[PDB]
Design a protein around this ligand. Structure first.
Ligand SMILES: CN1Cc2ccccc2NC1=O
Ligand SMILES: [K+]
Length: 119
């Protein structure tokens, strides 16, 4: 037989939310990622020409809090979208690129045992 695993939204929140919280706890590194990029406010007006699909911690949080992920990989893909956006837009030598790299490191550490537990 073949049975597709079903994940209830609270199941996903309780497993995955802690991994998001681990990123929020990183200070100063998470501060640029805690709200959607506002190009006008930040003085970076080319941002949306380069980044077509914006993502940030508050959006991911919202989606986890309101049951918008069906599968663990959907949550993971949004986290990587947020990081890949920042690695794409910002220069390798920049503060925000280096902050992104630190958050990705923390994320890789936290997510692996969670993915194993979710199966
Ligand atoms: C996620 N952010 C936020 C940000 C804040 C300040 C300067 C550059 C950026 N670029 C980004 O990619
Ligand atoms: K880049």
């Amino acid at each position: 037989s073949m049975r597709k695993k079903i994940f209830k939204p609270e199941e996903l929140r309780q497993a995955l939310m802690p991994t998001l919280e681990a990123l929020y706890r990183q200070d100063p590194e998470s501060l640029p990622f805690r709200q959607p990029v506002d190009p006008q406010l930040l003085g970076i007006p080319d941002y949306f020409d380069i980044v077509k699909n914006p993502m940030d911690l508050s959006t991911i949080k919202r989606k986890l809090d309101t049951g918008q992920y069906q599968e663990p990989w959907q949550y993971v893909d949004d986290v990587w979208l947020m990081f890949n956006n920042a690695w794409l837009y910002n220069r390798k030598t920049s503060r925000v690129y280096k902050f992104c790299s630190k958050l990705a490191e923390v994320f890789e550490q936290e997510i692996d045992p969670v993915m194993q537990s979710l199966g």
